[PDB]
Amino acid sequence: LSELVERGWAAALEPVADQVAHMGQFLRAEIAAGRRYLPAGSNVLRAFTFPFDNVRVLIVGQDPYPTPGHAVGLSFSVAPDVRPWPRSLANIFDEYTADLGYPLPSNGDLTPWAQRGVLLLNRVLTVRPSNPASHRGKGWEAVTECAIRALAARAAPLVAILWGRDASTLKPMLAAGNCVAIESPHPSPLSASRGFFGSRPFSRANELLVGMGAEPIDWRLP
Numbered sequence: 001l002s003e004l005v006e007r008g009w010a011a012a013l014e015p016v017a018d019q020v021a022h023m024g025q026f027l028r029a030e031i032a033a034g035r036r037y038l039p040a041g042s043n044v045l046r047a048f049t050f051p052f053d054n055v056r057v058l059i060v061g062q063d064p065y066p067t068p069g070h071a072v073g074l075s076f077s078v079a080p081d082v083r084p085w086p087r088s089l090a091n092i093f094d095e096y097t098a099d100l101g102y103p104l105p106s107n108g109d110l111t112p113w114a115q116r117g118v119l120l121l122n123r124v125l126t127v128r129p130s131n132p133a134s135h136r137g138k139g140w141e142a143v144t145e146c147a148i149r150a151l152a153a154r155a156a157p158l159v160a161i162l163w164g165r166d167a168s169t170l171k172p173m174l175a176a177g178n179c180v181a182i183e184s185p186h187p188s189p190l191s192a193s194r195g196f197f198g199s200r201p202f203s204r205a206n207e208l209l210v211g212m213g214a215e216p217i218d219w220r221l222p
């Protein structure tokens, strides 16, 4: 892993080295079968290329975007290029503006969040192109479970923003008093109107962080 991911993340993910390699073998066999995978191989583990020690907020999404160009190995982010935004990201940008009173971002690229210690983790790290949540139950779950347990274990505060019923089952792994869960319905249009709008997770996370003696997150995107 030492060559695929930042130093901290390589040590934290050591336990699932076997399983990362194994999911290597899965991507090879998908290309061989004529089904492909998003994101690019070089961006699958991309959420782990920013420092493990600097992570203070965990945003758990479920799967990479099914549309080529959307998925870039950071949950909810799209390529600077891409327009229009998937309605998921639009709904996240709605709430950002409502919560922080910033105007809408000029592109869909969330790397600045990654740079400031937001871990944009999908529970599953690949997807069959144009087929949503299609790589569930293949072996990613144990890899992203290992990442989360290792964040929760650190001598350091953590806010977990958990979007959707599925993301709420990760609460057991965050019971350690240094971790705090914010739960709401997923920003996907199917569920956005059931709780996500008005949920104020960006401002609440920073309140949480400051209460724990952590530096808050500059959420502002250009």
Ligand SMILES: O=c1[nH]cc(O)c(=O)[nH]1
Binding pocket: 061, 062, 063, 064, 065, 074, 075, 076, 077, 088, 122, 188
């Ligand atoms: O990266 C993501 N894209 C779209 C989603 O719905 C999600 O949960 N995660």
Ligand SMILES: O=c1[nH]cc(O)c(=O)[nH]1
Binding pocket: 097, 098, 099, 100, 101, 102
């Ligand atoms: O609409 C808004 N205006 C100003 C704010 O601070 C805010 O959080 N939301």
